[PDB]
Design an enzyme around this catalytic site. Structure first.
Site, PDB file in Angstrom:
ATOM      1  N   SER A   1      33.871  -4.943   6.357  1.00 19.29           N
ATOM      2  CA  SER A   1      33.888  -4.688   7.784  1.00 19.29           C
ATOM      3  C   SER A   1      34.868  -5.590   8.536  1.00 19.29           C
ATOM      4  CB  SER A   1      32.481  -4.827   8.351  1.00 19.29           C
ATOM      5  OG  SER A   1      32.389  -4.105   9.566  1.00 19.29           O
TER       6      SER A   1
ATOM      7  N   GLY B   1      17.769   7.557   3.931  1.00 21.63           N
ATOM      8  CA  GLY B   1      18.222   6.473   3.087  1.00 21.63           C
ATOM      9  C   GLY B   1      18.894   5.394   3.908  1.00 21.63           C
TER      10      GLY B   1
ATOM     11  N   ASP C   1      28.954   5.408   8.873  1.00 24.16           N
ATOM     12  CA  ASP C   1      28.125   4.782   7.851  1.00 24.16           C
ATOM     13  C   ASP C   1      26.975   3.977   8.448  1.00 24.16           C
ATOM     14  OD1 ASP C   1      29.232   2.430   8.846  1.00 24.16           O
ATOM     15  OD2 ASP C   1      30.019   1.734   6.925  1.00 24.16           O
TER      16      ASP C   1
ATOM     17  N   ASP D   1      26.043   3.516   2.971  1.00 28.19           N
ATOM     18  CA  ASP D   1      26.186   3.014   4.329  1.00 28.19           C
ATOM     19  C   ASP D   1      26.744   1.600   4.404  1.00 28.19           C
ATOM     20  OD1 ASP D   1      24.205   0.922   4.505  1.00 28.19           O
ATOM     21  OD2 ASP D   1      22.642   2.402   4.897  1.00 28.19           O
ATOM     22  N   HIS D   2      26.928   1.129   5.631  1.00 26.77           N
ATOM     23  CA  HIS D   2      27.494  -0.183   5.918  1.00 26.77           C
ATOM     24  C   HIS D   2      26.856  -1.353   5.181  1.00 26.77           C
ATOM     25  CE1 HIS D   2      30.610  -1.826   8.444  1.00 26.77           C
ATOM     26  NE2 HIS D   2      29.825  -2.801   8.865  1.00 26.77           N
TER      27      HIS D   2
ATOM     28  N   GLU E   1      24.467  -0.966   2.459  1.00 25.17           N
ATOM     29  CA  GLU E   1      24.266  -0.678   1.041  1.00 25.17           C
ATOM     30  C   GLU E   1      25.484  -1.052   0.208  1.00 25.17           C
ATOM     31  OE1 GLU E   1      23.815   3.591   1.389  1.00 25.17           O
ATOM     32  OE2 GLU E   1      21.622   3.407   1.429  1.00 25.17           O
TER      33      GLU E   1
ATOM     34  N   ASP F   1      21.244  -3.566   1.759  1.00 26.36           N
ATOM     35  CA  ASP F   1      20.262  -2.495   1.850  1.00 26.36           C
ATOM     36  C   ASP F   1      20.271  -1.834   0.475  1.00 26.36           C
ATOM     37  OD1 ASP F   1      18.463  -1.270   3.879  1.00 26.36           O
ATOM     38  OD2 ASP F   1      19.537   0.573   3.375  1.00 26.36           O
ATOM     39  N   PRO F   2      19.086  -1.523  -0.068  1.00 27.69           N
ATOM     40  CA  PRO F   2      19.012  -0.893  -1.391  1.00 27.69           C
ATOM     41  C   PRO F   2      19.487   0.556  -1.438  1.00 27.69           C
ATOM     42  CG  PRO F   2      16.865  -0.901  -0.404  1.00 27.69           C
ATOM     43  CD  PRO F   2      17.739  -1.759   0.486  1.00 27.69           C
TER      44      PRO F   2
END
Ligand SMILES: [Ca+2]
Ligand SMILES: [Zn+2]
Length: 388
Positions: free
Chosen positions: A113, A286, A317, A357-358, A360, A365-366
């Protein structure tokens, strides 16, 4: 294929709010609940180190800090810059993670990011330095950090993951919420408090030393409170929030350009699905709860055609608009080319878009479906295959 062409080390560079290895009780920004990315890479023969710069600071400040953390020394934000924004010129002192960069060595930077903007800026400053800092130093006869001289090329590659190169409209939502709850001012006040509490920094170090947020030695609360009210930090654009916004990201793109001596790789992310009726995007099942409820909705529906924010900005994301990730475009002359099996210098090698996503993508994040281990090892191999 294409085996080891270089043994240059790798440094990990976190984005917004990112914390160092010794913070958050060991919970790693680079790995999260999935593990320790730096360790996986090291265990596989890839010399890896982790940078920990201002989590809420501007890319300029973070770049200067990154530079000092790499070659060692006292952080120097630049006398011109310090004077312009109203904060200390000098910062923390570091021993140096890779002083070898001072005598021929090169380094691979993997950023997430906001880290992507910092990395690009570090390369731009190393390569071109800062004319403004040079002129100021000579005009007022003050010292100049080598970083502002130009002519340095120790960064071999820059890889960005989910980086908002053109900014993220999430900041636009924050702008609306400002009419009431002013998020930035709230975060600053909290940081001000923490700077005075004993052990806090061990868990989360705000690294806002340059603003002098903590009460000084013999300073009375009364004096302290009055000094804080006069601080320019509350209304400063020298913050991550500004560089992350749409207009702030473009201003950054106007001067931070792709160096022809450096390889650039970008990875895009998305975790949404398009509504057939509105065209708006919705978070998939998710996505981390925070993003899904607070950010995704606005990101997938906010438009501003006049500013160029069209339907192509809705896919996201959870934190950043996907179209903003392949490379700088707004106010940029950088070239972006689809990965064709051969990595090229001076251009952005679009490595593709991934369904993660951002959070994961860094393991915070799992997401069992995402083989995080393989993603980073595969990246390391490619970086190692780069020809100096
Ligand atoms: Ca998840
Ligand atoms: Zn600054």
């Amino acid at each position: 294929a294409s085996p080891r062409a270089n043994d240059a080390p790798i440094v990990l560079l976190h984005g917004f709010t990112g914390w160092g290895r010794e913070e958050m009780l060991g919970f790693k920004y680079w790995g999260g609940v999935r593990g320790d990315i730096e360790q996986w890479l090291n265990d596989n023969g890839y010399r890896t180190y982790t940078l920990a710069v201002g989590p809420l600071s501007s890319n300029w400040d973070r770049a200067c800090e990154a530079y000092a953390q790499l070659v060692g020394g006292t952080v120097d934000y630049g006398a011109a810059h310090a004077a312009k924004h109203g904060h200390a010129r000098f910062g923390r002192t570091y021993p140096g993670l890779l002083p070898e960069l001072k005598r021929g060595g090169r380094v691979h930077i993997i950023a997430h990011s906001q880290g992507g903007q910092t990395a690009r800026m570090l390369v731009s400053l190393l390569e071109n330095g800062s004319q403004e800092e040079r002129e100021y130093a000579k005009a007022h006869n003050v010292s100049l950090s080598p970083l502002f001289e130009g002519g340095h090329h120790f960064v071999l590659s820059v890889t960005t993951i989910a980086t908002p190169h053109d900014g993220t409209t999430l900041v636009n939502m924050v702008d609306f919420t400002d009419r009431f709850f002013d998020l930035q001012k709230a975060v600053l006040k909290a940081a001000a408090v923490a700077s005075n509490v004993p052990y806090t920094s061990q868990v989360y170090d705000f690294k806002l030393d340059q603003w002098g947020l903590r009460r000084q030695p013999g300073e009375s609360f009364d004096h302290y409170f009055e000094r804080l009210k006069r601080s320019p930090v509350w209304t400063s654009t020298d913050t991550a929030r500004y560089d992350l916004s749409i207009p702030g990201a473009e201003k950054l793109n106007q001067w931070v350009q792709a160096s022809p001596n450096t390889y650039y790789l970008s990875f895009s992310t998305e975790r949404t699905h398009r509504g057939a009726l509105t065209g708006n995007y919705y978070p998939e099942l998710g996505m981390n709860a925070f993003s899904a409820v607070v950010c995704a909705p606005f990101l997938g529906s906010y438009r501003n055609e006049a500013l160029g924010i069209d339907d192509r900005w809705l896919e996201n994301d959870g934190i950043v608009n996907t179209v903003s990730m392949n490379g700088p475009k707004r106010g940029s002359s950088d070239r972006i080319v689809p990965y064709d099996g051969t990595l090229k210098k001076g251009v952005w090698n679009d490595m593709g878009t991934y369904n993660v996503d951002h959070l994961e993508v860094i393991g915070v994040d799992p997401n069992p479906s995402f083989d995080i281990r393989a993603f980073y090892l595969r990246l390391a191999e490619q970086l190692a295959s780069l020809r100096p």
